[PDB]
Design a protein around this ligand. Structure first.
Ligand SMILES: *[C@@H]1O[C@H](CO)[C@@H](O[C@@H]2O[C@H](CO)[C@@H](O)[C@H](O)[C@H]2NC(C)=O)[C@H](O)[C@H]1NC(C)=O
Lengths: 55, 172
């Protein structure tokens, strides 16, 4: 039991290209997205652990 | 050092000279005092600033992002990233430290060469009109003055003028 539940929710993701369609189809157990995220990248970066104060 | 001037046959440095890196000290009938050599000092300064600008400005920029980015599913790729980081760390540390040592050795020797060269420039001009004391000084076999001292410093000294007077006082 994690947070009381013995069940789990497994998430996956994808990048849907422009002018392209996505197709969800399920007879059960689907946890559907209500939202998507527009995205752009000039380059990548990193993730920093600090605990405090952006100035 | 390498050219034997600084901490060499010229034992100490001059606190009294704030004017430059290398200069003269004259002691005559008028009065004593220090004076710098603008040419040699400025040349050295230009070279030295060009030196530290070389070891600083020649370094490549390269935007990067150092971090973990690898889960516990992949501890082999973590170890790979760690080997790489440390590999470069060992390279840059060793190279930087030895660079600084070798460059400092060169710099001190460079200064030594400059003083020695000024000494030789002077001695070559004065010739046997003076007694080379060996401490970095020259004792005149004649009577020089502020008007004559400036002649020595500025590169135009009249040897045949003081030739015969110096000779007689030399074999005195
Ligand atoms: C998804 O939507 C895009 C438009 O937002 C569609 O692309 C156009 O399709 C029409 C009909 O054939 C063409 O006349 C246009 O030339 C297309 N525009 C583009 C993107 O150049 C696309 O067909 C849609 N996908 C489907 C079939 O659902």
């Amino acid at each position: 039991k994690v947070n009381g539940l013995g069940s789990r929710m497994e998430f996956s993701w994808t990048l849907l290209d422009m002018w392209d369609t996505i197709n969800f189809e399920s007879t059960g157990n689907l946890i559907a997205p209500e939202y998507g995220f527009k995205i752009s990248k000039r380059g990548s970066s990193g993730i920093m652990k600090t605990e405090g104060t952006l100035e | 050092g390498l050219f034997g001037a600084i901490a060499g046959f010229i034992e100490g440095g001059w606190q009294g000279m704030v004017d430059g890196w290398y200069g003269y000290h004259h002691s005559n009938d008028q009065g004593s005092g220090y004076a710098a050599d603008k040419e040699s000092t400025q040349k050295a300064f230009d070279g030295i600033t060009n030196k530290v600008n070389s070891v600083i400005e020649k370094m490549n920029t390269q935007f990067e992002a150092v971090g973990k980015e690898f889960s516990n599913l992949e501890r082999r790729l973590e170890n790979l990233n760690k080997k790489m980081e440390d590999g470069f760390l060992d390279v840059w540390t060793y190279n930087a430290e030895l660079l600084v040592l070798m460059e400092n050795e060169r710099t001190l020797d460079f200064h030594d060469s400059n003083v020695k060269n000024l000494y030789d420039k002077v001695r070559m001009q004065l010739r046997d009109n003076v007694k080379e004391l060996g401490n970095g000084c020259f004792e005149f076999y004649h009577k020089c003055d502020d008007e004559c001292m400036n002649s020595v410093k500025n590169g135009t000294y009249d040897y045949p003028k003081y030739e015969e007077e110096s000779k007689l006082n030399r074999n005195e």
